Amino acid sequence: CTVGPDYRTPDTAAAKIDATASKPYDRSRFESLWWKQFDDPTLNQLVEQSLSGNRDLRVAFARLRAARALRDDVANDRFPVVTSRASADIGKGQQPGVTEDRVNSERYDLGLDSAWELDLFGRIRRQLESSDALSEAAEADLQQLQVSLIAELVDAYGQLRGAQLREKIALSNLENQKESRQLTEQLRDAGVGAELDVLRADARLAATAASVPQLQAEAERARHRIATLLGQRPEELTVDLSPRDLPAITKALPIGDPGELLRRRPDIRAAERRLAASTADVGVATADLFPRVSLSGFLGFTAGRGSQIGSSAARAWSVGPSISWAAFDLGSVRARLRGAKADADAALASYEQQVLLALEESANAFSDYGKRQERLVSLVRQSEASRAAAQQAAIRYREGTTDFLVLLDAEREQLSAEDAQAQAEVELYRGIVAIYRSLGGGWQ
Amino acid sequence: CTVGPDYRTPDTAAAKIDATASKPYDRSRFESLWWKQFDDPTLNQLVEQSLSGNRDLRVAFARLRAARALRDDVANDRFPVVTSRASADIGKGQQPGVTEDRVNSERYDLGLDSAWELDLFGRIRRQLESSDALSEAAEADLQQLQVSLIAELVDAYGQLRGAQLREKIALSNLENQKESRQLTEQLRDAGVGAELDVLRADARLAATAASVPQLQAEAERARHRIATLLGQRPEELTVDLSPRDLPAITKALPIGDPGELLRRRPDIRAAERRLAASTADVGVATADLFPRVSLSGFLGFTAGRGSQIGSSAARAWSVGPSISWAAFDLGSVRARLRGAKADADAALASYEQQVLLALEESANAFSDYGKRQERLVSLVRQSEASRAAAQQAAIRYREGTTDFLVLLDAEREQLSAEDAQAQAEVELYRGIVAIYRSLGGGWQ
Amino acid sequence: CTVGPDYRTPDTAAAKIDATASKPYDRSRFESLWWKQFDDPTLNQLVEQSLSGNRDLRVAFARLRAARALRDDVANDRFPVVTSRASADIGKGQQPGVTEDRVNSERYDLGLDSAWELDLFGRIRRQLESSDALSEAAEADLQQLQVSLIAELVDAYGQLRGAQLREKIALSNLENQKESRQLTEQLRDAGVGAELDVLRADARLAATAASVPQLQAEAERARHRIATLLGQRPEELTVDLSPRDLPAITKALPIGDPGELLRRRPDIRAAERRLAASTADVGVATADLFPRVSLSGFLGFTAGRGSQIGSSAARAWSVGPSISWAAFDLGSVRARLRGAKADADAALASYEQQVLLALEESANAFSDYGKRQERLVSLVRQSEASRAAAQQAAIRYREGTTDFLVLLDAEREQLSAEDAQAQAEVELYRGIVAIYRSLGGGWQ
């Protein structure tokens, strides 16, 4: 017999995301190694090294082995437990029932003890079923951490490239603002301009200069993050991260069927396996409503005189079958059952929350990616217009045919446009990372 | 007897917040359903649906039932434990004391076993007292999560309305900047203007256009959040969230006496009940300093021949009273006592931290609300002035009587003023949410 | 005997940070009370009071005492356990083997029971070794929390001073913008200016006014934080926090040898002690591969008639030596061993992650501090230039020799320069705090 409910997987509907019909996506195939589409061999090396060196990943793998070890232990409980023992019981006292004289007592034992709960109503079977589910849950945790890790690593690499990009932009715009400052300095020294212009120019030049260490600071924080994610010290980072361009994907994104995502995501699987474990735990609690059958034994030697231990005149065996039933203490058993059922309900609600958060993350990532493309279109146009306006005002300032503020403001709007655009490009990249994270890629 | 300390509630002083005398607040009454004052029926529906569907809430309710089940189990420990059993002991060996011959042994038993610790010094009573306190702590957790949930939901709804508001502002200002761009385009084509103006106008137009997808992106993230908080998939959201205005409260806020807040807040109660549980646990540890009285029994049948089980010639009963005292192993008992007392101290310090954080949150919310009103006054004036300045510069640009930058900068300052004002209005709304969160509203 | 692996400390290389050779740092000495270099007696008082009143610190100290109590309990397990007991066994039934008559049974006992596992293979010794390591781990947690607390407190105090600084800046710039607004108002009333100027001036004046409550709001949040960190209610804060200047350190920072940091940091120590505990736990699991020796006894009185208890005719003693070996159930023992080894691997990977994060935090703090100095140099120049430009434009606006926008924009750039500089100064201060946090200062 095996009592209590048999686990059935929740019948949960597949994820529908209508935006996936749209043009930026390719539903016919899904890349598990999603990050390789960036065609960035450096990045690829980072991910490979991360899988070897990352310590959080190494922790989670040990926790899996621990969970399996626990399951292996539970697995043995089906079989009788045979131990060997040698003991004695010596004393001197009265023997109530037998005699009021203080008499000597001497007993010697050497043999195998055995003990065994027959799993008649499946209590042990339901434990093993639970323990197996948790074992599988720990494996899904390992895989989810891998998904997270890769996303964090790819995301961080993109932030480094963004900081480097923005640095160069700042440095390039700084040179315009030195040339422009040189020009204003020449016009006051020729008698035609004014110091007010030089001051404004030097102020703006200082402002742009202040951004460069800050961007350099962000970059260095991103290098430090990347190193810890690889399992390396910051000093000892084996991958060269010299400035290269920000990776892009010109192709439509291979995202596969979005309905598949709940089945691909290990966090969802882990929550489902915890639900299975807790469902099995209801069985364990239900079995205690029913009788418990056990069988003890002894095989070996028993004597009053030690010299006889090991001889055939002192051979001994014993058998002790027992069945026990909680005749009146069902109150406590039914309390534990009510607790088991509540934990199962919790695990079900938990599982459903994970499903909901996955659909939320997923909805969020696609929703953002679409909007981040749109935003980038108009930001690219701002950068174009601003470069054009800046160069016109420069001409017209040199010819004395407009005041400096026109050129000051045009240089200001050039910087912020270019910089806003670089931020938006980074955000596209991060949105790709968000997408594949939400779909459960990189653990296979 | 019941040994160890009797729990006394901490005598903690009521919250004093001097700013509550101020005009924006009404101390005569407190609205438990605080969110209904916004007069927003959509929002009301969100909260109602959230209480039904939110899975985190469903989890916490199962955890309460689990805690009660545990308490019910502990509750039984006062009574004797009677189980039924049928067993045998068969063997063949020597009988030390009796005979050196290997002899057959056969015993058969059928009856009720009973076992019972008399709770003479209140160890079990102190367990039940602990377990009851934890049970009440789990209920307070459920209520605190409800407070948090409602605040998060109302807060998120306000962010959605803010994004929608800011979107329309951006769209409205975009149209000014198209008209203005059209105008600059007309003046170059009439021979009197310049391309520099058109470029600057197209740049600024692009910048404003870039904000619209971003605001739309925020809005869509807020919808996704709201859906998960309701217990729904993003696709399946039953409440229509089409753009409507941001809710306001024209009345002074019904906040009640702020001294009441510590007594209303379930987080505080939960920490207090954990302090009570740990205080009872000192009793449990103290009881082990004292003797332990127990009583076992057997009632049924006992015989050497199985055919006799059930007959009156094989009737059997047994009684086994026992008292035990740790004569020398008080060392271990006193160690556990020292640990129990330390846990109680921890629980007390924990409780005090919760009190302090509550007063911090509370101080913060009122402090911010007051300042957010002030800020809004002057920001409304900036918006007025900026609209006026923008329309003047527009006139004077059309008449050729000022250069474009005057109109460019005036359009820029109009956008940021209007947008800063919308952000500040949202922040007022969120500050109302912060306030009622800190006072412990929505669980009743 | 003591079986299983003997713990050896991980041989981890010292932290190398090449930037420490640089001029802003002093490696010859390290200040444990690092915060006192600010020469701020108020701050010093905050830290002193925090160490007395902070409840999180009080919690962690109770948890240490609890861990020690647990170790004390485990420590007793080496010695025999002697308890006193008085019991009886009364009944009436058959005596299988002896007689088929239902006979009366009566036994009375009064004496000392003793029980003792001889720690032959060091199972108990390895428990105590584990429990001692955890005890030391809880002490390191207390010290790490102290490091964190002090850093959070000093950091928060700096944010308060920053808000106060920025407030005064805003107020000062507000007065320029009132004077400037008054001026524009005078020029329209003399017939020579225009309303467009007044509107722009009033707009900008409102904008600056909106920042003041916001900065005041931040300040008040920082006061509330500080109070909770001290263990005080916000209302009851015993330290006067009236505006004073932001603390600086003109001297090079006493950072000591950076190689020392891993040895100084308590988080690292705590992780190492958990590794030691888990290593000892492998021993505990290994001991169960080997036989278990135990010795029970009874000393006192035993009789069939109660009146005889206490008499010498009813004297009784008993000795019960036993050795047991898992002859076939090594499967379960070896499963637990495999689990123990996995936990040890986890604890090792965990320890290595802590080392890596420490080096990351550390790398980050120095890296940022250097860059934050550079940034501040150029930001100070922006503030100088902007003040100069603002005062020039003011002159040239009064003389009617430039339009208002020139003065409007110059006032705008003055405010943001001054404000950006104050933020950068605060960030320097916070970076000092980050540094000493990462080096593990303040617990000694």
PDB file of C-alpha atoms in Angstrom, chain C residues 337-442:
ATOM      1  CA  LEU C 337      29.691  10.909   4.885  1.00  0.00           C
ATOM      2  CA  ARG C 338      29.184  11.883   1.252  1.00  0.00           C
ATOM      3  CA  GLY C 339      26.829  14.633   2.467  1.00  0.00           C
ATOM      4  CA  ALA C 340      29.304  15.841   5.035  1.00  0.00           C
ATOM      5  CA  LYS C 341      32.052  16.066   2.364  1.00  0.00           C
ATOM      6  CA  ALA C 342      29.723  18.022   0.038  1.00  0.00           C
ATOM      7  CA  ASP C 343      28.915  20.534   2.805  1.00  0.00           C
ATOM      8  CA  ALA C 344      32.640  20.971   3.404  1.00  0.00           C
ATOM      9  CA  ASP C 345      33.136  21.654  -0.337  1.00  0.00           C
ATOM     10  CA  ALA C 346      30.281  24.161  -0.180  1.00  0.00           C
ATOM     11  CA  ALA C 347      31.807  25.884   2.847  1.00  0.00           C
ATOM     12  CA  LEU C 348      35.170  26.035   0.951  1.00  0.00           C
ATOM     13  CA  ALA C 349      33.592  27.558  -2.173  1.00  0.00           C
ATOM     14  CA  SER C 350      31.651  29.949   0.083  1.00  0.00           C
ATOM     15  CA  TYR C 351      34.848  30.976   1.812  1.00  0.00           C
ATOM     16  CA  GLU C 352      36.520  31.622  -1.527  1.00  0.00           C
ATOM     17  CA  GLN C 353      33.536  33.770  -2.714  1.00  0.00           C
ATOM     18  CA  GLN C 354      33.862  35.903   0.447  1.00  0.00           C
ATOM     19  CA  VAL C 355      37.540  36.348  -0.314  1.00  0.00           C
ATOM     20  CA  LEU C 356      36.694  37.369  -3.862  1.00  0.00           C
ATOM     21  CA  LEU C 357      33.949  39.808  -2.869  1.00  0.00           C
ATOM     22  CA  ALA C 358      36.304  41.363  -0.314  1.00  0.00           C
ATOM     23  CA  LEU C 359      38.914  41.928  -2.993  1.00  0.00           C
ATOM     24  CA  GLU C 360      36.168  43.253  -5.274  1.00  0.00           C
ATOM     25  CA  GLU C 361      34.835  45.725  -2.646  1.00  0.00           C
ATOM     26  CA  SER C 362      38.414  46.712  -1.943  1.00  0.00           C
ATOM     27  CA  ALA C 363      39.417  47.143  -5.555  1.00  0.00           C
ATOM     28  CA  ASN C 364      36.212  49.186  -6.099  1.00  0.00           C
ATOM     29  CA  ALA C 365      36.795  51.551  -3.151  1.00  0.00           C
ATOM     30  CA  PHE C 366      40.362  52.561  -4.078  1.00  0.00           C
ATOM     31  CA  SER C 367      39.590  52.685  -7.781  1.00  0.00           C
ATOM     32  CA  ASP C 368      36.639  55.068  -7.041  1.00  0.00           C
ATOM     33  CA  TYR C 369      38.497  57.255  -4.542  1.00  0.00           C
ATOM     34  CA  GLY C 370      41.288  57.981  -7.042  1.00  0.00           C
ATOM     35  CA  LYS C 371      38.803  58.860  -9.781  1.00  0.00           C
ATOM     36  CA  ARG C 372      36.667  60.932  -7.394  1.00  0.00           C
ATOM     37  CA  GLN C 373      39.682  63.131  -6.589  1.00  0.00           C
ATOM     38  CA  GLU C 374      40.408  63.764 -10.272  1.00  0.00           C
ATOM     39  CA  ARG C 375      36.770  64.576 -10.978  1.00  0.00           C
ATOM     40  CA  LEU C 376      36.719  67.041  -8.065  1.00  0.00           C
ATOM     41  CA  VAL C 377      39.698  69.019  -9.442  1.00  0.00           C
ATOM     42  CA  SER C 378      37.946  69.899 -12.691  1.00  0.00           C
ATOM     43  CA  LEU C 379      34.557  70.410 -10.981  1.00  0.00           C
ATOM     44  CA  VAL C 380      36.150  73.032  -8.674  1.00  0.00           C
ATOM     45  CA  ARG C 381      37.354  74.839 -11.819  1.00  0.00           C
ATOM     46  CA  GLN C 382      33.873  74.715 -13.316  1.00  0.00           C
ATOM     47  CA  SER C 383      32.497  76.365 -10.173  1.00  0.00           C
ATOM     48  CA  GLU C 384      35.148  79.126 -10.398  1.00  0.00           C
ATOM     49  CA  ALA C 385      34.594  79.843 -14.068  1.00  0.00           C
ATOM     50  CA  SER C 386      30.798  79.760 -13.634  1.00  0.00           C
ATOM     51  CA  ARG C 387      30.816  82.268 -10.773  1.00  0.00           C
ATOM     52  CA  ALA C 388      33.016  84.550 -12.888  1.00  0.00           C
ATOM     53  CA  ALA C 389      30.800  84.176 -15.970  1.00  0.00           C
ATOM     54  CA  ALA C 390      27.662  84.755 -13.908  1.00  0.00           C
ATOM     55  CA  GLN C 391      28.984  88.034 -12.458  1.00  0.00           C
ATOM     56  CA  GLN C 392      30.158  89.292 -15.893  1.00  0.00           C
ATOM     57  CA  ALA C 393      26.785  88.617 -17.518  1.00  0.00           C
ATOM     58  CA  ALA C 394      25.099  90.325 -14.588  1.00  0.00           C
ATOM     59  CA  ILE C 395      27.190  93.476 -15.254  1.00  0.00           C
ATOM     60  CA  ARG C 396      26.567  93.356 -18.993  1.00  0.00           C
ATOM     61  CA  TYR C 397      22.823  92.831 -18.479  1.00  0.00           C
ATOM     62  CA  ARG C 398      22.599  95.871 -16.145  1.00  0.00           C
ATOM     63  CA  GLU C 399      24.394  98.001 -18.762  1.00  0.00           C
ATOM     64  CA  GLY C 400      21.838  96.853 -21.444  1.00  0.00           C
ATOM     65  CA  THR C 401      24.824  95.459 -23.472  1.00  0.00           C
ATOM     66  CA  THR C 402      23.545  91.804 -23.677  1.00  0.00           C
ATOM     67  CA  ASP C 403      20.129  90.069 -23.589  1.00  0.00           C
ATOM     68  CA  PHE C 404      18.799  88.244 -20.471  1.00  0.00           C
ATOM     69  CA  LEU C 405      19.286  84.660 -21.756  1.00  0.00           C
ATOM     70  CA  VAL C 406      23.054  85.219 -21.410  1.00  0.00           C
ATOM     71  CA  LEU C 407      22.506  85.978 -17.715  1.00  0.00           C
ATOM     72  CA  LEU C 408      19.798  83.282 -17.350  1.00  0.00           C
ATOM     73  CA  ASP C 409      22.043  80.566 -18.710  1.00  0.00           C
ATOM     74  CA  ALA C 410      25.023  81.813 -16.708  1.00  0.00           C
ATOM     75  CA  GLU C 411      22.965  81.575 -13.456  1.00  0.00           C
ATOM     76  CA  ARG C 412      21.819  78.105 -14.434  1.00  0.00           C
ATOM     77  CA  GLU C 413      25.382  76.864 -15.036  1.00  0.00           C
ATOM     78  CA  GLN C 414      26.533  78.489 -11.731  1.00  0.00           C
ATOM     79  CA  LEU C 415      23.923  76.566  -9.737  1.00  0.00           C
ATOM     80  CA  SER C 416      24.608  73.189 -11.371  1.00  0.00           C
ATOM     81  CA  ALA C 417      28.405  73.592 -11.073  1.00  0.00           C
ATOM     82  CA  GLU C 418      28.266  74.453  -7.378  1.00  0.00           C
ATOM     83  CA  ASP C 419      25.760  71.684  -6.771  1.00  0.00           C
ATOM     84  CA  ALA C 420      27.667  69.094  -8.784  1.00  0.00           C
ATOM     85  CA  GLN C 421      30.760  70.044  -6.761  1.00  0.00           C
ATOM     86  CA  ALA C 422      28.999  69.555  -3.431  1.00  0.00           C
ATOM     87  CA  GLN C 423      27.808  66.112  -4.612  1.00  0.00           C
ATOM     88  CA  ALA C 424      31.381  65.251  -5.634  1.00  0.00           C
ATOM     89  CA  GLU C 425      32.735  66.315  -2.226  1.00  0.00           C
ATOM     90  CA  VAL C 426      30.195  64.090  -0.528  1.00  0.00           C
ATOM     91  CA  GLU C 427      31.211  61.268  -2.837  1.00  0.00           C
ATOM     92  CA  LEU C 428      34.853  61.722  -1.773  1.00  0.00           C
ATOM     93  CA  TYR C 429      33.748  61.402   1.848  1.00  0.00           C
ATOM     94  CA  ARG C 430      31.694  58.325   1.114  1.00  0.00           C
ATOM     95  CA  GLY C 431      34.630  56.815  -0.779  1.00  0.00           C
ATOM     96  CA  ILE C 432      36.809  57.160   2.342  1.00  0.00           C
ATOM     97  CA  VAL C 433      34.063  55.313   4.212  1.00  0.00           C
ATOM     98  CA  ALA C 434      33.941  52.640   1.512  1.00  0.00           C
ATOM     99  CA  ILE C 435      37.730  52.221   1.766  1.00  0.00           C
ATOM    100  CA  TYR C 436      37.888  51.585   5.506  1.00  0.00           C
ATOM    101  CA  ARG C 437      34.827  49.367   5.345  1.00  0.00           C
ATOM    102  CA  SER C 438      36.616  47.220   2.758  1.00  0.00           C
ATOM    103  CA  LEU C 439      39.770  47.015   4.892  1.00  0.00           C
ATOM    104  CA  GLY C 440      37.841  45.811   7.977  1.00  0.00           C
ATOM    105  CA  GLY C 441      38.269  48.750  10.368  1.00  0.00           C
ATOM    106  CA  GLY C 442      36.416  49.720  13.523  1.00  0.00           C
TER     107      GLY C 442
END
